[PDB]
Amino acid sequence: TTLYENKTGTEDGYDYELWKDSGNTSMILNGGGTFSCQWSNINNCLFRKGKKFGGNQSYQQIGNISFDYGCDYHPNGNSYLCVYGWTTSPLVEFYIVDSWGSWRPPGGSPKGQIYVDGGTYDVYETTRVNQPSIQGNTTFQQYFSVRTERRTSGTINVTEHFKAWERMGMRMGNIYEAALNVEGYQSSGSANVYKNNMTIGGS
């Protein structure tokens, strides 16, 4: 229930992962979607809990996807706190970022704004040509919604970001996974996800 090295698994209905390329990481797996983590001397690391979806379905088929979450979030350098996931056909890596450390991701310039869940989100898109992905080295898009001001608790209605992105011409494939995610880059920090209730279904 405390992880220190790369591991993926499932507990209490939530898929979890700790991953780092190097450095010190720890992750306490608490009930349900909740977890606690710390990192130092890392290059890249991530800690996440959510779901790898069991079918090959669109978000209209899966039903509502939302995270009712709360995190006591103390990054010491580069870091962000987000919902993270992928779609396939088309292949998309997506991010809904609510807070960050020293650097607000992803860089570049937004193409729109979404007013949802009491906040304003900047929308970004990238193409990454022949780069590592969940389907090997290949080309994929990245979609980002990044809050204009930091917050660390509330509801992220992922379905509404999906719908807004599609209205802005950003096609969603079948949903592969979605998880509440803490990232670190060349930094130290800690975060306690004390609440993470992931809705999957219905309207």
Numbering used by the authors: 30 to 232
What wording appears in the published article?
We analysed a multidomain xylanase (Xyl) from the hindgut metagenome of the snouted harvester termite Trinervitermes trinervoides that releases xylobiose and xylotriose from beech and birch xylan and wheat arabinoxylan. The four domains of Xyl include an N-terminal GH11 xylanase domain, two family 36-like carbohydrate-binding domains CBM36-1 and 2, and a C-terminal CE4 esterase domain. Instead, individual domains and domain combinations were investigated structurally and for possible interdomain interactions. Xyl exemplifies a “beads-on-a-string” protein where the individual domains are “beads” each connected by a linker (string), with each domain retaining its individual function- making the synthesis of novel super enzymes for rapid and efficient degradation of bio-waste to biofuels within reach.
